[PDB]
Structure 1
Amino acid sequence: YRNFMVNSYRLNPNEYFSVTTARRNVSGDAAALFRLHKFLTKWGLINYQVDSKLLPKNIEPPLTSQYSTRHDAPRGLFPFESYKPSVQLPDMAKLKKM
């Protein structure tokens, strides 16, 4: 029943997949089919995009954009660090030995 309802909605998502067509197309009592259809449409998954609208246009401020990231930005998270090379001549000798 569930695969029937989900497969039947996704052929034409602009249409509200009613309870009555599901009742008329699979054999079973109307109470359990109504409860399963209302559970299914409760969680999205069917009748989620019946009346879809278009987001018009986004006037994007800087740093709120794709590829709006810089090496100069602070890594608050992303815990991997980039470390300063210490160039000291006894430490150069220590690095050559180690």
Structure 2
Amino acid sequence: PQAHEIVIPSYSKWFNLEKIHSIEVQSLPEFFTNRIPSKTPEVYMRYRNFMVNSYRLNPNEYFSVTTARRNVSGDAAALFRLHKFLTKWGLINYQVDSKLLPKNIEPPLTSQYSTRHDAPRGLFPFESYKPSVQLPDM
């Protein structure tokens, strides 16, 4: 079931609840040297998706690392590390507060799209004189 409108600070638009990215490993490598068998990318992803789901459930109100610690753990240390990490990356606890505005209007508006000088791809505002017709066209 889905019952909320979830936004994220766009630059984060590299994260995918399905997969992992070179970003986080360079920020949390301690699950990837394959040295500590009790840790693995897999349990990492488990924790990850679990927590993000939790937050996305009722994101209007905050979510603590202590919460997850109560819920599931294999460690406090790494748990906190990654939790605060995602916090930084706003994937979690980002919409804890709401802010609004009346937004008065100005001459530029999103529904304004007219004919005017253009920086984009080519366009020809002057077509052809008379003698151009003088060609054995295709």
Asked whether the two chains share a fold, i.e. TM above 0.5, the reply is yes
Shift of 1:31: 0.8
Work out which of the two has the higher radius of gyration on C-alpha atoms and give 1 or 2.
Answer: 1
* TM-score, with length taken from structure 1: 0.66
1:11 matched to 2:52: no
Write out per-residue CA displacement over residues 75-94 of structure 1, whole angstroms, 9 at most, x where no aligned residue.
Answer: 57999999999333677xxx
Larger mean Cα displacement after TM superposition, 58-67 or 27-36: 58-67
Provide TM-score, normalisation by structure 2. 0.49
2:96 is equivalent to residue 54 of structure 1: no
Q: Is the 8 A contact 1:62 1:68 kept in 2?
A: no
Q: Which runs of 4+ in 1 moved over 3 A?
A: 62-86, 88-91
Greater alpha carbon shift after TM alignment, 66-75 vs 19-28: 66-75
Residues 65 and 89 of structure 1, relative CA distance in 2, 3 Å threshold: same
* Consecutive unaligned residues in structure 1, runs of 5 or more: 92-97
Q: For the residues of structure 1 that align with 2:85 and 2:129, how far apart are their CA atoms? A: 54
RMSD: 4.7
> Once the 2 structures are TM-superposed, how far is the Cα of residue 24 of structure 1 from its aligned partner?
0.4
Paired with 1:21 and 1:42, the residues of 2 have a C-alpha distance of: 17
**Kept after mapping to 2: 8 A contact 1:63/1:69:** no
Equivalent-residue separation in structure 2 for 1:74 and 1:38 (angstroms): 43
Q: How many residues align?
A: 92
Provide the rounded CA distance (Å) in 1 between the counterparts of 2:87 and 2:128. Answer: 49
Identity %, equivalent residues: 100
Unaligned 5+ runs, structure 2: 1-46
